[PDB]
Amino acid sequence: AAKDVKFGNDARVKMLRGVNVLADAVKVTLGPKGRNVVLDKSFGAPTITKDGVSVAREIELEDKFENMGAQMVKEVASKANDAAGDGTTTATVLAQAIITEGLKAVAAGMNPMDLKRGIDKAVTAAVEELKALSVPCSDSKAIAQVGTISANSDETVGKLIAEAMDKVGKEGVITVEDGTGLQDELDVVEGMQFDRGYLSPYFINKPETGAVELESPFILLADKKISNIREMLPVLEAVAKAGKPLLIIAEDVEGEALATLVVNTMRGIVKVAAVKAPGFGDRRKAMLQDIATLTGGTVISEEIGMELEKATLEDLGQAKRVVINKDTTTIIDGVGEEAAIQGRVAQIRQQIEEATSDYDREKLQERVAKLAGGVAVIKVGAATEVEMKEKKARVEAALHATRAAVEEGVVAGGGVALIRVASKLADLRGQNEDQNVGIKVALRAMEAPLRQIVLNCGEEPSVVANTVKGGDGNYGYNAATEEYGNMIDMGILDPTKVTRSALQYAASVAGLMITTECMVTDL
Amino acid sequence: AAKDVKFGNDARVKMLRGVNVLADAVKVTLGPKGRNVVLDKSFGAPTITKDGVSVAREIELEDKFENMGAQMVKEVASKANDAAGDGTTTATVLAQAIITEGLKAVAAGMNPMDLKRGIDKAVTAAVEELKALSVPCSDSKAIAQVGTISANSDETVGKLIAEAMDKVGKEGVITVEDGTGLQDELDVVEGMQFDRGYLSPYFINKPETGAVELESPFILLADKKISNIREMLPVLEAVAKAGKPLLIIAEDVEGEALATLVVNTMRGIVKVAAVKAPGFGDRRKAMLQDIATLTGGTVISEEIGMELEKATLEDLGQAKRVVINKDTTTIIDGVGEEAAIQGRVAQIRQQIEEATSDYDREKLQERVAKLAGGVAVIKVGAATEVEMKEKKARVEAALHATRAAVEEGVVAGGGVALIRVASKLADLRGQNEDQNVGIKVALRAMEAPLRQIVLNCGEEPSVVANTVKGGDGNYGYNAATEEYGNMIDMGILDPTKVTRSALQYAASVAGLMITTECMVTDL
Amino acid sequence: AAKDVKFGNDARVKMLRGVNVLADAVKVTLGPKGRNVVLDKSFGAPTITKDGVSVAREIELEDKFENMGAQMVKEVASKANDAAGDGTTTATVLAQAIITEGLKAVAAGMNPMDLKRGIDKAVTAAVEELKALSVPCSDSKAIAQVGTISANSDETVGKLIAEAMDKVGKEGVITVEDGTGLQDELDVVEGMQFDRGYLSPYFINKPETGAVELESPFILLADKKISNIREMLPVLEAVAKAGKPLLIIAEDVEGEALATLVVNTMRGIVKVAAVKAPGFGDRRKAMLQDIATLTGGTVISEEIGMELEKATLEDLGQAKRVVINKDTTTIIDGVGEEAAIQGRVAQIRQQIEEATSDYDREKLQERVAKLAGGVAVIKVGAATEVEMKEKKARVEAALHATRAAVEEGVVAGGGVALIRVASKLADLRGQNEDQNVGIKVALRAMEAPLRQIVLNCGEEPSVVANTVKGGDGNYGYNAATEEYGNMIDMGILDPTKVTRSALQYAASVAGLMITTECMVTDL
Ligand SMILES: Nc1ncnc2c1ncn2[C@@H]1O[C@H](COP(=O)(O)OP(=O)(O)OP(=O)(O)O)[C@@H](O)[C@H]1O
Ligand SMILES: Nc1ncnc2c1ncn2[C@@H]1O[C@H](COP(=O)(O)OP(=O)(O)OP(=O)(O)O)[C@@H](O)[C@H]1O
Ligand SMILES: Nc1ncnc2c1ncn2[C@@H]1O[C@H](COP(=O)(O)OP(=O)(O)OP(=O)(O)O)[C@@H](O)[C@H]1O
Ligand SMILES: [Mg+2]
Ligand SMILES: [Mg+2]
Ligand SMILES: [Mg+2]
């Protein structure tokens, strides 16, 4: 309907207020100092989680303007959250500080554009500093510590992550499942994971994550694309006798012919999934073969002249479960044959050696690696189901952060990096004063999140911040210790990527918020 | 729609108030001192039951926040209630005490996390103490006493439970049915019970319990899974002539093929149930045979080459009634053949002796035991139908508690164990003061429920509690006696499991409530 | 329903107020001095763009009268915006100034008709002056500057435009696509663009622009019109096996026979597009051949006697993507054959030389040119997706302005031309005093937008305007420099066309607004 539009400060104020409200809840929560949080639901019994984001997610502002402003922060934060895996709160915190200052500057009447530019400039500088500052991720002990941070003093999670990580290998993917029982179980599962997307979000399964899990999926592998129903049909007929959920692997499915018939014609009542076959060219075929062996199913190719129609259910392999995400599709455990799987690996392994070329070797080695590596599953036990879910969520978050952290390497946590960089940043000047102030603002913003932790401590963040700044090198405040020590030595490190990601997003949000002169809402 | 969100104390207060309201009603009811209770219904004539839970169930809070808070307690309590079979109220009572104190601490501004940790720590310690404290369940006389407790001075129920228990055997399952007449009837029913789930909750019958009872069920046993309709169909055709409700036993039914056709295609107007055949492997087959003999029906196997289609109704056995619960499925009474059943038992019995191996013996013995044991049914008479229903419900509750109690063993009732443990607990210290207070709080919480009983007595719980604490060993207050005596000697014992369960859940709830900074509701 | 009607000043005032509100937001935004702008949305997260228009678009007036008045300005402005590519704001600014003065005159009670006439007369004179004033567009360096203006100090955009422009050629069309990644990519794409409309807006694709883009379009070329389904059908059948989206090229499709069947009979679920074949006569055929070669598809003609029905999918070519706009339809990249395409070009090229006649040469040369030129695609990277979209939009706007600007040639920006012309204009007199005032008003209107920029600067526009007027030749104020210098030398030039377009439209609007005695609204 009609929209109410506000311009200038009035628009800004609404945004600011909204931002603060969201930020405030988030800020307190963030930091190990902050207590976890439970979220009430009108819908049903309250949801128990430990995420800054969740608080934000819950929080809605009645005021449209405020709400919208709040929303803006959240969306950006989530984006940072996804990439970083962590630091959702941090970005929010950073954004709020930046925005407020920026708004004040707007109040100043300085031209916000320069400020944004200055902020951006500052951010870039900070990023560079951070990168230099950052150091490679430390060993598993560090990993556990990294895990613990995501843990928020969940020792078990960190341990689990480290343990899972060790067995699987850092590179190897780790999957989390609900625990069978209170005791956690870590079982390596045989199977291969290949990075393939899900063709359509429609395929995407019930769960919020949107990764699709199939129970006892059936795997059909075809090198060939599945053009039309007719070729499909005789597969289907066997499938009808089946009815265990179907997963399909094809080089590609041409959307219209297959999908049009499938969607419109076919109810698709039986669960189906489609993924592109991994790799391309011979390698793709090889990968398919590897998959096929692991599945224990067989692959049909035109070259073979095997017909999909002809192929029965038996040809299709089965998996204990399959999980698919947009980035990647994995099979937790193909039934496979133990001998068969091993034999294939050896054969591939032999091939790897055989090939003179690195390229050939790499492909072969990659192929073997996938099968050999398998996938790792982690079960989280809990005293209660609710706890388990909560624990599981935390575990998952930790895992992603840990994985990201390791690759990125770790930087001192506590926003130490942020504060440290800022000091260097301060010297840098923007082109013009307006830019200069913005740059300063950004610096100020960085400082704030350190303070917030301190505030949670109840120690006066001013002293801490001042002290932190004074210390050269990696100097920081450990909340738990409440003692000054090297962050690295302490072993509490925040991932570089996460820190970087959050800062950039927050800056972006802040800049956007500052710029946005006007807001419009519905009446 | 839009949600109203509250944070901090404000959120807490709403929860607290809600908790109190629910708790208060429950607390008074709990304890033999408390009077039973009737629940009004707008729907229709009031419902008469004797459960603390029911009061809670009825109670809804108009305030969303309060209501939600209330809900949280209830849900946890119910969970405890299910496992313990009893102590629903106790958990609620415990939770309330813990929550209030925890909230106060929150008011204190101590970091609730430590408190929760302390509480958890305290709980763990208490649990250990309780376990040591607990003693094995006493004999039937004790059992009756246990029954009486569930009875809340329902002598008959305890007697019935004991009587039923004796005949059936404690291990043997006892089932309760509405009494034919005022006089209770205890009839042992021939039949076997095997622990199998119901495939789908959809199958789950009308009654609230969700156990499904079939009247004159027909039993089809197939070793083989029922893949598809077609094989099924000729069974069905016979069934059409039939129309007595069908129960199906199959090793498994593959969901999609059978279910998809069945659900979509088949109205399923005739009652149908499916259960997995008990056991696996040969034993499963053997079990099926045992079942088949008991049913008097025949089993069809691929190995036999008998066809389901071929099999007629006659092949299917009939049961007088079948009850299915998720944990287990039982047949109250297969028509069976008296001779046939006996013969099979003997044959199995011979087999048991025959097998050298323990394993073989165990399976065989288990098989015979099921048939031999049969199931026991208890009828509850009542002056009026309404009374009977009420009585029946009480009886059922008592039975579960008794069964749980016996296995667990009995500990002094009256919350004596709780108070006793607490004293020991007090010495234990948490890591930090905040934890310490939480630990103390938990201890305090334990004490409270003893007081509540005393309050019902009208005696000043302080003195009683003090006295109780002072006494070493099992020292407690018997409400009925209003005299001090050994709980064990008194023979009023609360099950260890129930006590433990309630405490843990309550603690969990309390901890959660404390933690939950914020609540959100719809507007 | 019933309408509320206002006449005379009352109607005018509502319009005026509405105009001002819209204008005010726009005016501030306009000019590099003005900050960009973000637009709030009730619908979802706010939209980030940099357009004066967008602000106007957002702005709606609650008052019907005001809103309607506001709408009038916007619609005209947009029209100017489309043609000019730029100067949307300028027109709005101009209109507002004119309207207010005109209204005042209406208040004066002078007969507005004369005023309108005077305004029109003034406009015409101004236009002539502008045209003389205008100079040809300068070289790429200028182009970049032109780009930067559209950029609003987006250096990259200007660079991209210049870079894209250089490679493609100014004449050559440049297309913008979202960047694959943060880094922009400029790839020339092989393909030909021919100016053909889309038969129906229905065809028009999802995007707001209404240009239709097909992914991997299939191209069917027929010289012949597609009369009816039947001939079509065998094409369709092949297509059914297909299902990649179809694009159709035909000399014409007779609407009723094809469309009636197609629309009604055919769901048209598969994407389809139709375009008229470029050119007419032999040239058209030749063009088709060129297209066909580029596509790699084949064309079917009656003369050939090839049947559409007979023709398979293979005959149809494929394009990586096709974009269609009403003015023109382009194929970004036909798969084509590299050799084939080249060969055809050579063949055509030979033909061009071969033909004695200029006419023949021109057609041939044009034909070759299209293939040879190909299309250029620009990718815009962004830190974030949102940014990219915003950047992309800006880029697109810049491109259109640049293209227009170059052809038109550049005139001094800053409204320098407008002010300059006005002085000359002032001498000119209208037929009658009422006309005279209107003429003056128009002159005044022209001056205003210069002032607005100055106002953004915060410099007093009076002095600047006076100074600007005083300077002969191209004299203007550079906001960025805040120094006086030649506009041309500065290199900040606004396109003649855009300036002219905006002025004319604004004048038209203003005249209309003045004339409109009465407004009617719904109640
Ligand atoms: N003992 C500690 N001393 C100093 N800072 C710590 C300590 N443990 C963790 N932190 C810091 O607390 C922050 C991590 O907490 P949290 O994960 O809540 O923040 P976040 O990642 O921004 O929020 P969210 O995880 O909800 O997105 C990091 O800056 C981390 O270094
Ligand atoms: N004569 C008695 N003296 C002392 N305490 C008693 C006596 N009889 C029963 N109790 C105690 O009263 C409590 C049992 O009552 P009740 O079953 O109402 O509590 P509850 O199990 O927590 O509530 P609900 O059964 O509604 O879940 C136990 O702690 C039990 O030991
Ligand atoms: N440094 C400068 N000095 C003087 N005027 C400038 C300078 N850079 C740009 N301008 C002027 O600002 C105006 C262009 O800004 P803008 O594109 O916002 O106006 P617009 O085209 O009317 O609005 P829109 O683009 O929203 O339709 C032109 O008159 C242009 O010459
Ligand atoms: Mg985090
Ligand atoms: Mg009880
Ligand atoms: Mg413009």
Cα distances (angstroms) measured from residue C515 to each of B343, B437, C18? 111, 82, 16
Q: How many CB atoms lie within 10 A of CB A252?
A: 13
In the reported structure, the alpha carbon of residue C15 is separated from the centroid of ligand 2 by a whole-number distance in angstroms of 80
Q: What is the DSSP letter of C264?
A: I
Protein residue closest via CA to atom 19 of ligand 2: B30
Residues 6+ apart with CB under 8 A from A45: B68, B71, B72, B75
Q: Within chain C, what is the greatest distance between any pair of CA atoms?
A: 76
Cα distances (angstroms) measured from residue A173 to each of A38, A178, A276, A331? 30, 17, 20, 11
Torsion angle, alpha carbons of A89, A91, A96, A98, to 10: 160
Residues 6+ apart with CB under 8 A from B269: none
Tokens at B131, concatenated: 């376990």
What SS3 class is residue B187? strand
Q: What is the DSSP letter of B223?
A: S
Q: Rounded to an integer, what distance in angstroms lies between the CA atom of residue C129 and that of residue C121?
A: 12
If residue A463 lies in a helix (H) or strand (E), which one and from where to where? helix A461-470
Count helices and strands (H / E) in chain A: 18, 20
End-to-end Cα spacing for chain C: 7
Burial of B273 (C-beta count, 10 Å sphere; 0-12/13-18/19+): buried
* Residue A452 beta carbon below 6 angstroms from any ligand 1 atom: no
Atom of ligand 1 nearest to the CA of A88: 27
Resolution for the entry shown, Å? 8.0
What SS3 class is residue C389? helix
Single-letter code of the amino acid located at A418: L
Neighbors of chain B by Cβ distance (3+ pairs < 8 Å) = A
Q: Is B330 one of the annotated binding-site residues?
A: no
End-to-end Cα spacing for chain A: 7
Q: Rounded to an integer, what distance in angstroms lies between the CA atom of residue B350 and that of residue B361?
A: 10
* Residue A456 beta carbon below 6 angstroms from any ligand 1 atom: no
What SS3 class is residue C278? coil
Q: Which residue has the tokens 């502002």?
A: A61
What SS3 class is residue A304? coil
If residue B494 lies in a helix (H) or strand (E), which one and from where to where? strand B493-495
Q: Measured in whole angstroms, how far is the alpha carbon of residue C295 from the centre of its chain? A: 28
Torsion angle, alpha carbons of B457, B462, B467, B470, to 10: 140
Cα distances (angstroms) measured from residue A395 to each of A161, A398, A434? 8, 5, 44
* CB-CB under 8 Å, C243 with A2: no
* Residue A175 beta carbon below 6 angstroms from any ligand 1 atom: no
Burial of A314 (C-beta count, 10 Å sphere; 0-12/13-18/19+): exposed
Q: Rounded to an integer, what distance in angstroms lies between the CA atom of residue A352 and that of residue A340?
A: 18
In the reported structure, the alpha carbon of residue A144 is separated from the centroid of ligand 4 by a whole-number distance in angstroms of 15
Whether the CB of A152 is below 8 Å from some CB of chain C: the reply is no
Torsion angle, alpha carbons of A184, A189, A192, A197, to 10: -40
Q: Measured in whole angstroms, how far is the alpha carbon of residue B179 from the centre of its chain? A: 22
Torsion angle, alpha carbons of A157, A161, A167, A171, to 10: 170
Q: Rounded to an integer, what distance in angstroms lies between the CA atom of residue C423 and that of residue C470?
A: 9
Q: Rounded to an integer, what distance in angstroms lies between the CA atom of residue C179 and that of residue C156?
A: 13
Cβ pair C39, C55 in contact under 8 A: yes
Single-letter code of the amino acid located at A305: G
In the reported structure, the alpha carbon of residue A31 is separated from the centroid of ligand 1 by a whole-number distance in angstroms of 4
Q: Rounded to an integer, what distance in angstroms lies between the CA atom of residue C335 and that of residue C319?
A: 6
Q: Rounded to an integer, what distance in angstroms lies between the CA atom of residue B374 and that of residue B382?
A: 26
**Sign of CA pseudo-dihedral A72, A75, A79, A85:** positive
Tokens at A220, concatenated: 């059909």
Question: Residue length, chain A?
Answer: 523
Q: Rounded to an integer, what distance in angstroms lies between the CA atom of residue C404 and that of residue A39?
A: 57
Cα distances (angstroms) measured from residue A457 to each of A32, A148, A493? 10, 18, 18
Q: Rounded to an integer, what distance in angstroms lies between the CA atom of residue A172 and that of residue A399?
A: 12
Q: Rounded to an integer, what distance in angstroms lies between the CA atom of residue C175 and that of residue C376?
A: 6
* CB-CB under 8 Å, A515 with C40: no
Q: Is C87 one of the annotated binding-site residues?
A: yes
Residues followed by a break in chain B, C–N over 2.5 Å?
Answer: none
Q: Within chain B, what is the greatest distance between any pair of CA atoms?
A: 76
Best residue for ligand 3 mutational test, from C86, C402, C481 (most atoms within 8 Å of Cβ): C86
Radius of gyration from C-alpha coordinates of chain B: 26
Tokens at A522, concatenated: 């519905």
Q: Is B4 one of the annotated binding-site residues?
A: no
Q: Rounded to an integer, what distance in angstroms lies between the CA atom of residue C439 and that of residue C125?
A: 10
In the reported structure, the alpha carbon of residue C156 is separated from the centroid of ligand 6 by a whole-number distance in angstroms of 17
Q: What is the DSSP letter of B46?
A: P
Q: Would you report the helix, strand and coil content of chain B in percent, each value rounded to 5?
A: 55, 15, 30
Residue A119 — φ and ψ, nearest 5°?
Answer: -65, -45
Using alpha carbons, select from B142, B85, B89, B29 the residue that is nearest to residue B487.
Answer: B142
In the reported structure, the alpha carbon of residue B490 is separated from the centroid of ligand 5 by a whole-number distance in angstroms of 18
Q: In the A/B pair of chains, how many CB contacts fall below 8 A?
A: 101
Using alpha carbons, select from C180, C217, C216, C182 the residue that is nearest to residue C198.
Answer: C217
**Sign of CA pseudo-dihedral A123, A126, A128, A131:** negative
Whether the CB of C63 is below 8 Å from some CB of chain A: the reply is no
In the reported structure, the alpha carbon of residue A88 is separated from the centroid of ligand 1 by a whole-number distance in angstroms of 10
Using alpha carbons, select from B160, B169, B187, B197 the residue that is nearest to residue B369.
Answer: B169
Axis-axis angle for helices B433-457, B8-29 (nearest 10):
30
Q: Rounded to an integer, what distance in angstroms lies between the CA atom of residue A281 and that of residue A301?
A: 13
Q: What is the DSSP letter of A334?
A: B
Per CB-CB distance under 8 Å, the chain A contacts of C42 are 3, 64, 68, 520-522
* CB-CB under 8 Å, A79 with C40: no
Per CB-CB distance under 8 Å, the chain C contacts of A75 are 45
Nearest CA in chain B to A269: B260
Burial of A23 (C-beta count, 10 Å sphere; 0-12/13-18/19+): buried
Long-range contacts of A317-321 (CB under 8 A, 24+ apart): A317/A218, A317/A219, A317/A221, A317/A292, A318/A216, A318/A217, A318/A218, A318/A219, A318/A244, A319/A191, A319/A214, A319/A216, A319/A217, A319/A218, A319/A219, A319/A247, A319/A295, A320/A189, A320/A216, A321/A213, A321/A214, A321/A215, A321/A216, A321/A217
Q: Which residue has the tokens 């958990």?
A: B91
Burial of B207 (C-beta count, 10 Å sphere; 0-12/13-18/19+): exposed
Q: Rounded to an integer, what distance in angstroms lies between the CA atom of residue B238 and that of residue A375?
A: 49
Using alpha carbons, select from A91, A87, A128, A156 the residue that is nearest to residue A400.
Answer: A87
Q: Are strands B375-380 and B186-189 parallel, antiparallel or unpaired?
A: antiparallel
Q: Which residue has the tokens 């809605």?
A: A60
In the reported structure, the alpha carbon of residue C143 is separated from the centroid of ligand 6 by a whole-number distance in angstroms of 15
Residues 6+ apart with CB under 8 A from A410: A134, A135, A136, A137, A138, A142, A146, A488, A493, A494, A495, A496
Q: CB under 6 Å to ligand 3: residues?
A: C 30-32, 51-53, 81, 86-90, 149, 413-415, 453, 478-480, 492, 494
Q: Rounded to an integer, what distance in angstroms lies between the CA atom of residue A333 and that of residue A347?
A: 21
Q: Rounded to an integer, what distance in angstroms lies between the CA atom of residue B179 and that of residue B377?
A: 10
Q: Is C51 one of the annotated binding-site residues?
A: no
Residues 6+ apart with CB under 8 A from B137: B143, B146, B405, B406, B407, B408, B409, B410, B495
What SS3 class is residue C348? helix
Which among A3, A513, A517 has the least Cβ separation from residue C37?
Answer: A517
Whether the CB of C37 is below 8 Å from some CB of chain A: the reply is yes
Q: In C351-475, which ranges are E strands? A: 375-380, 410-412
Q: What is the DSSP letter of A46?
A: P
Q: How many CB atoms lie within 10 A of CB C327?
A: 10
Q: Rounded to an integer, what distance in angstroms lies between the CA atom of residue C37 and that of residue A519?
A: 10
Q: What is the DSSP letter of C262?
A: I
Q: Rounded to an integer, what distance in angstroms lies between the CA atom of residue A37 and that of residue A50?
A: 6
Burial of C452 (C-beta count, 10 Å sphere; 0-12/13-18/19+): buried
Using alpha carbons, select from B142, B205, B198, B149 the residue that is nearest to residue B170.
Answer: B142
Using alpha carbons, select from B502, B74, B81, B508 the residue that is nearest to residue A44.
Answer: B74
* CB-CB under 8 Å, B256 with A25: no
Whether the CB of C42 is below 8 Å from some CB of chain A: the reply is yes
If residue C100 lies in a helix (H) or strand (E), which one and from where to where? helix C88-108
* CB-CB under 8 Å, C55 with A518: yes
Tokens at B177, concatenated: 């049915």
If residue A135 lies in a helix (H) or strand (E), which one and from where to where? none
Q: How far is A358 from chain C (nearest CA, A)?
A: 29
* CB-CB under 8 Å, B64 with A42: yes
* Residue A415 beta carbon below 6 angstroms from any ligand 1 atom: yes
Tokens at A328, concatenated: 């990647």
* Residue A94 beta carbon below 6 angstroms from any ligand 1 atom: no
Using alpha carbons, select from B502, B499, B481 the residue that is nearest to residue B412.
Answer: B499
Q: Measured in whole angstroms, how far is the alpha carbon of residue C352 from the centre of its chain? A: 33
Q: Rounded to an integer, what distance in angstroms lies between the CA atom of residue A496 and that of residue A406?
A: 9
Mutate which: B512, B521, B522, B523, vs A, most A CBs within 10 A: B512
Using alpha carbons, select from A25, A19, A27 the residue that is nearest to residue A461.
Answer: A27
Q: Rounded to an integer, what distance in angstroms lies between the CA atom of residue A110 and that of residue A102?
A: 10
* Residue A495 beta carbon below 6 angstroms from any ligand 1 atom: no
Q: What is the DSSP letter of B61?
A: -
Q: Rounded to an integer, what distance in angstroms lies between the CA atom of residue A285 and that of residue A292?
A: 10
Residues followed by a break in chain A, C–N over 2.5 Å?
Answer: none
Using alpha carbons, select from C227, C207, C223 the residue that is nearest to residue C215.
Answer: C207
Residues followed by a break in chain C, C–N over 2.5 Å?
Answer: none
Nearest CA in chain B to A34: B111
- Ligand closest to A459 (CA) is 1
A357-386 residues touching B, CB cutoff 8 A: 383-384
* CB-CB under 8 Å, A383 with B72: no
Cβ pair C380, C168 in contact under 8 A: no
Q: Rounded to an integer, what distance in angstroms lies between the CA atom of residue B279 and that of residue B223?
A: 11
Using alpha carbons, select from B154, B436, B162, B175 the residue that is nearest to residue B328.
Answer: B175
Axis-axis angle for helices B496-515, B385-408 (nearest 10):
100
Neighbors of chain A by Cβ distance (3+ pairs < 8 Å) = B, C
DSSP A47-108: EEE--HHHHHHH---SSHHHHHHHHHHHHHHHHHHHHHSS-HHHHHHHHHHHHHHHHHHHHH
Per CB-CB distance under 8 Å, the chain A contacts of B522 are 42
Using alpha carbons, select from B343, B315, B316 the residue that is nearest to residue B331.
Answer: B316
Mutate which: C21, C40, C214, vs A, most A CBs within 10 A: C40
Single-letter code of the amino acid located at C492: I
Do chain B and C touch: 3 or more Cβ pairs under 8 angstroms? Answer: no
Using alpha carbons, select from A50, A39, A47 the residue that is nearest to residue A398.
Answer: A50
Tokens at A366, concatenated: 């990659």
Using alpha carbons, select from B311, B158, B146 the residue that is nearest to residue B221.
Answer: B311
What SS3 class is residue C134? coil
Using alpha carbons, select from B473, B474, B477 the residue that is nearest to residue B464.
Answer: B477
* CB-CB under 8 Å, B227 with A40: no
Q: In the A/C pair of chains, how many CB contacts fall below 8 A?
A: 101
Q: Rounded to an integer, what distance in angstroms lies between the CA atom of residue C331 and that of residue B514?
A: 64
Q: Which residue has the tokens 């009352």?
A: C10
Locate all alpha helices (DSSP H) within B318-432, ordered by sequence. 338-354, 358-373, 385-408, 416-427
Residues 6+ apart with CB under 8 A from B21: B59, B61, B66, B70
Q: What is the DSSP letter of C135?
A: B
Count helices and strands (H / E) in chain B: 18, 20
In the reported structure, the alpha carbon of residue B447 is separated from the centroid of ligand 2 by a whole-number distance in angstroms of 14
Q: Rounded to an integer, what distance in angstroms lies between the CA atom of residue A489 and that of residue A412?
A: 9
Cβ pair A520, A4 in contact under 8 A: yes
Nearest CA in chain A to B67: A42
Tokens at C22, concatenated: 């819209």
Count helices and strands (H / E) in chain C: 18, 20
Question: Nearest-5° angle of CA B371, CA B377, CA B379?
Answer: 170
Per CB-CB distance under 8 Å, the chain B contacts of A384 are 76, 79, 505, 508
Axis-axis angle for helices A496-515, A385-408 (nearest 10):
100
Which residues sit opposite A222 in a β-bridge? A250, A300
Q: What is the DSSP letter of C413?
A: T
